[PDB]
Design a protein around this ligand. Structure first.
Ligand SMILES: Nc1nc2c(ncn2[C@@H]2O[C@H](COP(=O)(O)OP(=O)(O)OP(O)(O)=S)[C@@H](O)[C@H]2O)c(=O)[nH]1
Ligand SMILES: O=c1cc(O)c2ccccc2o1
Lengths: 297, 304
């Protein structure tokens, strides 16, 4: 009866992202690692693991289609599937859309998570990364797109910091939503609400914010609604999800001030899903995640 | 904090990493890369990558370094994605086989292309392993040295002059230990500093572009421990009697919190008296409450 959430990392970048989620204690989900390369295997502590290798996206797609039945049996039962090939290119890019289409034909709410690489990484031809997004958005209910370039606006970031930041915000692209659904807080939500703003919703962007001390929830919320990762698209989004993670001492009044701000910041006709998550490991810090989907005609 | 990643590649490198994990080396991420799937399933590394499955069946590179080089290069995008974010990468291997000899330069070059401070720590095989393993290790060391800021070379032959005079497995365990000593002697300055704090920036200043290097290790307890451990270390057979001509020297003294500045300083006086007249010498200390009344000096010598 409660939502069954499965999180699928496919390809080297995807299995590695899933391994990071496991090491950071992301709870309440089933982890699935799918390897798509014949020549190598990244190992994983995921609950469920499937090797389909039997650096090219076409290779990753054929490997996944060859295993469509096995893949489908792993996904059967899920209310929600996340699919990511994480950072980097590779076969995962090709296999991701196959997993996503299987999940959506199964009727799971299917959320793709994809990263645009930094511009300083170059491009390898076919417009490979752009095609990978398009194929994924062709088969996802919601595609969360993380533009890594916008991280360089979040300061005077070093090259190592830029990579560590990309990893962290990718992880949050899953955690911020899944914790809202799976983990109790003062303000809880219905999986059905979440299904309503994300189903058939198309492309989404994300924003994050953190603060300590006085007015932490309003500060963190204002950082999140203003995140360069949202690419100034908050005002036109027709679906908006916001989750506030903090300690269990966080007062209703302060929470509500953040909820009121996202409503002022959002388009008047937007669906807004608002909740909180008790995470006492955070001290007097509070962490806001904002997912914006849709667009205004 | 600086993000430190330690890569064991090939069988010996993966075994050294397990020993690092067994002995509690902290503050680093351990990455095991091998061409044998069952040896990687016995690894306790945080991250594990099986390469060359098409070209080796998961049974090693058959002592062929070109096989190990192609297997790592085939996985270069994956490896790069595992290293991304590190300020410091160590690349550790037993030279002379196929996987470590061939693959270590690829891992190192990725770390260097990312701009991480890239430190190799590798062993020369024992003379009794035969002349092809020595030849292959020679080429592998030369390739590795092109892609490392500092490449620490540990001659296994000299291990047999130290400690107890037994068993083949015992000797390789000794290799595992000295590889750990070379990694820990450096990483602990950054992750668990004592009184004389030598941070990542300092280590980067002395180790960047430094070239080939040797190490010495020494420990002692009781009266005059810090002087004793320092003298064993600067006289270590692993230093191949070349300490005294080295112009860059990094030295760490690890001890419990009862280790006094006076003790530390007396060891430092001894080392710089014995050093090259023009040598750059950096001394740092490591708080390690696990050592009891023991003190442990590690010495890294480059620039001969
Ligand atoms: N530290 C350490 N060194 C080892 C161990 N076993 C072998 N060595 C050393 O490392 C060298 C390389 O061995 P090994 O690492 O196992 O080969 P490999 O790189 O995996 O190459 P392969 O795939 O062709 S079998 C050996 O020649 C020996 O000198 C070990 O258990 N610990
Ligand atoms: O550690 C493992 C073992 C495997 O069988 C596997 C298969 C596919 C994907 C990831 C995997 O990680």
């Amino acid at each position: 009866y409660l939502a069954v959430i499965k999180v699928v990392g496919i390809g080297g970048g995807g299995v590695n992202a899933v391994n990071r989620m496991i090491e950071q204690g992301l709870k309440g989900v089933e982890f699935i690692a799918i390897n798509t390369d014949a020549q190598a295997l990244l190992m994983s502590d995921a609950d469920v693991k499937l090797d389909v290798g039997r650096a090219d996206p076409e290779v990753g797609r054929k490997a996944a289609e060859d295993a469509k039945d096995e893949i489908e049996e792993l996904l059967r039962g899920a209310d929600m599937v996340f699919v990511t090939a994480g950072e980097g290119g590779g076969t995962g890019t090709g296999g991701a859309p196959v997993v996503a289409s299987i999940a959506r034909k199964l009727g799971a709410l299917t959320v793709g998570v994809v990263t645009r690489p930094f511009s300083f990484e170059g491009k390898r031809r076919s417009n490979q990364a752009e095609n990978g997004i398009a194929a994924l958005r062709e088969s996802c209910d919601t595609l969360i797109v993380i533009p890594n370039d916008r991280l360089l606006q979040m300061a005077a970031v070093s090259l190592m910091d830029a990579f560590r930041s990309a990893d962290e915000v990718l992880l949050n692209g899953v955690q911020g939503i899944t914790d809202l659904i799976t983990t109790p807080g003062l303000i809880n939500v219905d999986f059905a609400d979440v299904k309503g703003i994300m189903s058939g919703a198309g492309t989404a962007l994300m924003g994050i914010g953190s603060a300590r001390g006085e007015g932490r929830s309003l500060k963190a919320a204002e950082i999140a609604i203003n995140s360069p990762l949202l690419e100034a698209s908050m005002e036109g989004a027709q679906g908006v999800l916001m989750s506030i993670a903090g300690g269990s001492d966080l007062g209703l009044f302060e929470i509500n001030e953040a909820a009121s701000l996202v409503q002022d910041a959002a388009h008047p006709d937007a669906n807004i899903i608002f909740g909180t998550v008790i995470d006492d490991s955070l001290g007097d810090e509070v962490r806001v995640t904002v997912i914006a989907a849709g667009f205004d005609v």
